[PDB]
Paper text:
Here, we characterize an upstream component of parasite GPI anchor biosynthesis, the putative [name] ([name]) (EC 5.4.2.8), [name] ([name]). PMMs are responsible for the conversion of mannose 6-phosphate (M6P) to mannose 1-phosphate (M1P), the precursor to GDP-mannose. [name] and other PMMs are part of the haloacid dehalogenase (HAD) superfamily of proteins (Interpro: IPR023214), a ubiquitous family of enzymes that primarily conduct phosphatase and phosphotransferase reactions. By regulating the expression of [name] in transgenic parasites with a TetR-DOZI-inducible knockdown system, we demonstrated that [name] is required for malaria parasite egress and erythrocyte reinvasion, and we assessed the role of [name] in GPI anchor synthesis by autoradiography of radiolabeled glucosamine and thin layer chromatography.
To uncover the structural basis for [name]-specific inhibition, we solved the X-ray crystal structure of [name] to 3.5 Å resolution. Like other known PMMs and members of the HAD superfamily, [name] comprises two domains with an overall fold similar to that of HsPMM1. There were no large structural differences in the overall three-dimensional folds of the human and parasite enzymes. Although many active site features between the Plasmodium and human enzymes are conserved, an active site loop contains significant sequence variations. This loop in [name] contains Met173, Gln176, and Ile179, whereas the corresponding residues in PMM1 are Arg183, Met186, and Phe189. To develop a model for how compound D9 may interact with [name], we computationally docked the ligand into the active site of the [name] X-ray crystal structure. The resulting position of D9 in the [name] active site is similar to the crystallographically determined binding mode of mannose-1-phosphate in the X-ray structure of human PMM1 (76). The docking solution orients the hydroxyaminomethyl group of compound D9 in proximity to the sidechains of residues in the variable active site loop. Furthermore, comparison of D9 to similar but less potent compounds used for [name] inhibitor screening, D7 and D11, indicates that the hydroxyaminomethyl group is a key determinant of [name] inhibition compared to the human [name]. Finally, the crystal structure of [name] is likely to be valuable to ongoing efforts to develop more potent and specific [name] inhibitors as antimalarials.
Author numbering: 9 to 246
The structure:
Amino acid sequence: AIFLFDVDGTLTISRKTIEQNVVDTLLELKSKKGFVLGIVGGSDYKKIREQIKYPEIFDYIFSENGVVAHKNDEEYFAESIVNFLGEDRLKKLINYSLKYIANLDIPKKRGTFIELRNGIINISPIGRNCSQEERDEFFRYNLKNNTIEKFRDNLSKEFEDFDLNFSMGGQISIDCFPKGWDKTFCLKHLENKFDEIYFFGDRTDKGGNDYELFCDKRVKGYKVKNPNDTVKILRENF
Ligand SMILES: [Mg+2]
């Protein structure tokens, strides 16, 4: 049996490192007669390893929603979005996005409008690099005019043919990933004779990242509030 965890918000306070109260609890699990630990999070592995200090507690580490798997701190294997779309359809979605981001009248435009990660293509009309304030400042401009929801409605319809999903990302970006690459993807790597897999996430409701995993019959899911509540949900049942 393996245990599965969301990184940001479930094992650590989001964007910061891991408190020692929690890691002491995981050590007891892999020290309880028959348990292995694995994690799945949207972030690239460098951020994840930074967040958890020790990748060695974890037999299997799945980053970018399981489209990237790691083991004993070696990469092993992981695919890319370009291998899915192909160089042609990509230079179609790309230059439609910039041509739209271009002619869009918003007050502040910056840079890194299209970030290519392994799993997703992050599209953002203001731009990825902007002082944390400009991030929040555009978030409220979004509440007034719903600028970003209008963006997805174009891509979601124009590229309905691409088998593509465009879900609203953070405050300033729309994540663009292939259909069925939510978080249930990491199930593909776990036919390793593992009888029961338990999962722990944050936003396990529809319109959330780890929602599609919970109701995937394959595994029992638990909804936790915060990391201190998580440690409670572990100690209580295990
Ligand atoms: Mg989370």
